[PDB]
Ligand binder design. Structure first.
Ligand SMILES: OC[C@H]1O[C@H](O[C@H]2[C@H](O)[C@@H](O)[C@@H](O[C@H]3[C@H](O)[C@@H](O)[C@@H](O[C@H]4[C@H](O)[C@@H](O)[C@@H](O[C@H]5[C@H](O)[C@@H](O)[C@@H](O[C@H]6[C@H](O)[C@@H](O)[C@@H](O[C@H]7[C@H](O)[C@@H](O)[C@@H](O)O[C@@H]7CO)O[C@@H]6CO)O[C@@H]5CO)O[C@@H]4CO)O[C@@H]3CO)O[C@@H]2CO)[C@H](O)[C@@H](O)[C@@H]1O
Length: 375
């Protein structure tokens, strides 16, 4: 009498937690598996028919947009959830009602192959030097490298590059939707720097679709020293038996930190659930210290619950350490409605600039005009 919709990578986790929740309270938790973002895309239509899962996971930006749009029930933050000021703020929409319980904090980090390299690269000049070295030449197209790869046409990925250089999405720390900073001078240096890398990379890095699969394949097959990716990738890398280390993203050519979004995920409850109390109850259990520790144990993702998070910090694995440092150098993932209009124009900006189809400034100005349109 309760259904949880999650990504495959959480199946084992939810199976175990369900088994315990059934023992503690008297509720049967059945799981439905599928694309997380895709489940949220259809939420509005599922709310129309009543056929919604009882609990699902959302990135914080989507907690804000889906919440602001009426698609989500309000969520209560129990004492057991062990939230802090920053995780509370990440699940509070502009209105500002609470539409999720914090489950994960995350930042992009640098994964590197310990079989290929002795130490973590520290600067972007280090990554550029690996580009020079010849075991990383790409077959069939030269002179291209796979020494360092990042999915820099995904705005979530590139953002930190632009922001480290002075770019911003919205003014007043992601709140002022009228002041867009994606076409400032710093943003343009970020974009131009991105371009220089695309000019050293396989043309497939510019593919309209699966650059993500190319990156993953190259790294797992021992062809790339370093990539930038999220903690969610860890389960897969362990499966691929990759001998990976994790470090903070190397400092930029300007010496500044790669200022990735300070993001993560919450447990959310669709607006159309039969029984909100029952859903809140399982959510309280999921964010309770024990289940949050088990989340770290099963996925290596960093718990939002501050007690469970200290546990992960104590475990002191390279990934947790890097996520924690990196999170100090982030600005929070914006959760105002208007963020939802940013991702697509920004992605097109990046494709157009790095391919040289538009110059960087023009691509940015065009992206900003289109974002301005949508809000
Ligand atoms: O090689 C290209 C591409 O390949 C992969 O991407 C796949 C996806 O796996 C698959 O889901 C689908 O993507 C669809 C997507 O399903 C649609 O919803 C839509 O995506 C929109 C989205 O709806 C918008 O909200 C906005 O997304 C933002 C997002 O809201 C924001 O939070 C952030 O997302 C990052 C997130 O916060 C992180 O947690 C993480 O998400 C992980 C989870 O942690 C993990 O638990 C599990 O669920 O997988 C998630 C990854 O899917 O990373 C997120 C960043 O990747 O930023 C995004 C913007 O990126 O905008 C998007 C785009 O308009 O459309 C897309 C595309 O049709 O199909 C693609 C294949 O193309 C790979 O994952 C990706 O990195 C590669 O770039």
């Amino acid at each position: 009498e309760l259904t949880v919709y999650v990504d495959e990578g959480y199946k084992s986790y939810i199976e175990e937690v369900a088994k315990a929740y059934e023992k503690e309270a008297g509720v049967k938790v059945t799981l439905k598996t599928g694309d997380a973002l895709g489940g949220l895309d259809k939420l509005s239509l599922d709310n129309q028919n009543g056929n919604v899962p009882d609990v699902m996971m959302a990135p914080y930006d989507r907690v804000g947009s889906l919440g602001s749009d009426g698609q989500l029930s309000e969520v209560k933050l129990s004492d057991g959830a062990k939230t802090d000021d920053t995780t509370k703020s990440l699940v509070t929409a502009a209105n500002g009602k609470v539409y999720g319980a914090p489950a994960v904090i995350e930042s992009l980090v640098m994964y590197y192959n310990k079989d290929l390299v002795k130490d973590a690269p520290k600067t972007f000049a280090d990554l550029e030097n690996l580009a020079k070295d010849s075991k990383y030449a790409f077959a069939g197209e030269d002179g291209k490298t796979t020494a360092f790869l990042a999915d820099w046409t995904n705005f979530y990925y590139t953002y930190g590059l632009l922001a480290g250089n002075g770019a911003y999405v919205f003014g007043q720390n992601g709140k002022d939707a009228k002041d867009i900073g994606l076409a400032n001078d710093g943003s343009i240096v970020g974009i131009n720097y991105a371009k220089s890398w695309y000019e050293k990379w396989p043309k497939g890095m510019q593919d309209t679709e699966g650059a993500g699969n190319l990156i993953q394949t190259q790294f797992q097959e021992g062809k790339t020293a370093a990539i930038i990716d999220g903690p969610w990738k860890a389960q897969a890398f362990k499966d691929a038996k990759v001998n990976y280390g994790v470090a903070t993203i190397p400092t930029l050519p300007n010496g500044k930190e790669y200022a990735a979004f300070g993001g993560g995920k919450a447990w959310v409850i669709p607006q159309a659930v039969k029984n909100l109390e029952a859903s809140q109850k399982f959510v309280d259990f999921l964010v309770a210290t024990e289940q949050q520790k088990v989340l770290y144990d099963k996925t290596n993702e960093i718990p939002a619950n501050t007690e469970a998070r200290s546990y992960a910090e104590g475990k002191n694995d390279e990934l947790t350490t890097a996520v924690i440092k990196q999170f100090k150098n982030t600005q929070p993932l914006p959760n105002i409605s208007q963020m939802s209009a940013v991702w697509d124009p920004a992605k097109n900006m990046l494709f157009d600039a790095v391919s040289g189809q538009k110059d960087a400034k023009t691509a940015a100005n065009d992206a900003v005009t289109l974002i301005k349109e949508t809000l």
